[PDB]
Each structure stands twice: as structure tokens, then as C-alpha cells.
Nucleic acid binder design. Structure first.
Length: 82
RNA sequence: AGAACCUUACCAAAUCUUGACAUCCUUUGACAACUGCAUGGUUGUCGUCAGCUCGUGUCGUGAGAUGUUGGGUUAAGUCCCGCAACGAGCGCAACCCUUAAGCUUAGUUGCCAUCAUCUCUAAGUUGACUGCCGGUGACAAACCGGAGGAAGGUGGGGAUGACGUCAAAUCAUCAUGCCCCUUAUGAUUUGGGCUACACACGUGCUACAAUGGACAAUACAAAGGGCAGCGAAACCGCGAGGUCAAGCAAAUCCCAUAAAGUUGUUCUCAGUUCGGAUUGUAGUCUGCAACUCGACUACAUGAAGCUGGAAUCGCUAGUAAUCGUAGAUCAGCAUGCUACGGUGAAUACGU
């Protein structure tokens, strides 16, 4: 989802990786697909007001050279809300 | 944003009557099931047209004026010069995700300069504010221009839809003045009905030709989708089916080595060798079902139509003409509906 939280975490993971002995090689951003809804704005009798609603989901995997198992244990729990 | 029994909302038989939609020890079945003209709220509309104004001082017996008039500019009471006026908030402008050349930075299921086997992907930031420039316009807010300009003077668009509406579209999205149904069709299965036709019609569509018909073999993008489920490669009635087999939880697997197209191109205007409606017996998907009432496939079959009276409407270059596609509502069907890519011509002297 939101991108003010994930890249806020994208340098704390290095602090976890440089704690146990993991060397990072730039985890890369992944693309984002926008699902498109277009519902009518008035209910009865009318059609031609087509209100716009979307939804965003930013994919992001973590690509390094040396995933050390003392680092991976606290890796994927800082990005996604409920 | 899907009529085979859809929402039985409507109509016949039956049924149950706190139930069969908030209900019930899962049709009673210990258990596994054996009136918008009374109203809120959203919104249709003039209208992406630019305005509707109040505090507060004064002139007027008084409703009311003045400021908002005037001089010039100016998308727009937009901006600066005058005056019995002085301020002031609303919205276009203003806050802006998305848009058009960047360095440090970040090398996947991605691009590898070299051996061969830059951007998208987001981030603080960088850039056009008349900021300064020759003119003149009181120097007072603009002028073709221009130094940085790949990007002109709101760059190209979009969420942005005023004050105020025509008791006007909606009691069928939704609660209630009447509980917009609770014991009446109120509700539950098949069956009928929305689906037929003499016509009138909103609007779109396959077309009427050689700006072409057979089009076999023949290059490329973008934007989506998937453990409801995406189904290639070698390769089955050529074909209705994408069998078989692999990969698939998402850039890779698949949809899908699309589309404008180029070398072939035999046809000679023969109502056709242009064209589709539909007929007609076998044949696939679907389930309880293909009568009334689906949708695909080709062998065999082709009536009106040789570019359209009076009449209607679209639009200034990434639109117009359109071949092609990308999705939700589904066991199953839309040209609808709405998000992307290719060539991309015509015309602005003026009111």
C-alpha cells in the first residue's frame, strides 16, 4: 500500500543487516498496478455521471546479495497494514 | 457492471403465516441435515459560464443606492492608477497525485559499453516568478521578442461543479410524518410472462466496392489479468474444442511471438468473384434443463441494398477515420460499457 512507510523502513533494514553480518546490494522497488472502478454517481434514472475510484498496491521485494538467516527473521514485517 | 425459472415485483396450482430476505436447536427437521407536493441524504441541470456578496461610516422621509461606477488593462468584480467610502471572506487561479531532457543515488522474475553466453521501476531535490532584457506605453498593470528554453507565457490535461435554483429526477440505494408488506400475494418450488409485432421510434451496427474481395505463408508496442482461476511450446473433425505436457501465486508462466502493414494477389464491375439477415439436417459448451427463451464451427444455402428527399449532429492536430484490442457483473452470451496503442491530412482574412 502506502509509500511513506516502506521507504521509511528502507534504511532500518540495513541497520538490522549490518548488525548480524549481512551485506546488502540494493533492494529494488517493484511496479504498481492500479485497479480501476467506475461507478455511477446518481442512482435512479441517470447513468452519465461516472465517478472515478482507484486502488493502489506497491509491490516491493528485497533483493540483496547475502540474505543471512539472522537478518531474514525480522525482514518482511514493516510494510503492510491490517 | 449480464432476462433458461431475472428481484413470484407481476399471473394459476400447492405451501408455509415470527416465516421463506435483520427471522428458526441450517423449509418446522437432539446432531452430520438425515405517495419525493410531508420528509433525510446523494445528485441530474443552467455551468468550467463568473459571479453571489456581508461588516461598517455617510447621502436618501422611504424601499434603496454608494464600495463593485470611473482611466486602462485583462482567461475570470483577473491586476495595478482615481474618487465618502473602508475593509472583507467564496471559487476559477491557489494546495496538486499524474506530464514533458537531470546528477548523487537503487543493478529483480529487469538494460548489460566491453568477453559474449538511458528511461520505465520512487526520492529528497533541479528547472519559466517578467525573475532581467532593446522599444514605447505617466515609470501603471500588459506588447512581438529574449539571456538560461527539450518544456510559454494557467505549457498539455484532471480531482475542482459556486450564492441560488425551476415544491423539479429518486419512498425502487436508504430511515421515518403513514413501519416505503407482516399474516395480506406477505412469502416459498415448477410453469407461464417481460422474449410477439402492422406499425411509430432513441440510438448504434454488417454493409453496398476495386480509396477493393481469397488474403496461405509475413515484422513490432502499450495497458491489464490469474490457487473464482492464467493454460503456450512439438502437436488432434484444417476448423465447435486450444487435447497431451510444463510453468503459475506473480514482470518471468499464460493471455499473446495483436493491430495501421509490406512481397505475393489469380477477380473485371458479371446484384458480383460486393454483401449480410435468415433458411435447412447432422455436430460442440452448459445443467435439472436449449420448446416457448442461449451462445459458438464449417461443409451445403444468400431475398432488400449500385452511397440516401425535407432533414440531424460531431471537431482545431496527438482529437478526427477507426481495423484491432485491455475489464468488471457471469456455469453461459453484448457492437454495450470504458481504460490503452498505430498512421495522423484539410481549414482561423475576419466578427
Amino acid at each position: 500500500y502506502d509509500h511513506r512507510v516502506i521507504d521509511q523502513s528502507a534504511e532500518k533494514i540495513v541497520e538490522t543487516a549490518k548488525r548480524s553480518g549481512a551485506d546488502v546490494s540494493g533492494p529494488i522497488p517493484l511496479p504498481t498496478e492500479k485497479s480501476v472502478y467506475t461507478i455511477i454517481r446518481a442512482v435512479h434514472g441517470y447513468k452519465d455521471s461516472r465517478e472515478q475510484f482507484e486502488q493502489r498496491t506497491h509491490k516491493r521485494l528485497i533483493d540483496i546479495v547475502n540474505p543471512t538467516p539472522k537478518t531474514v527473521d525480522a525482514l518482511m514485517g514493516l510494510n503492510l497494514p491490517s
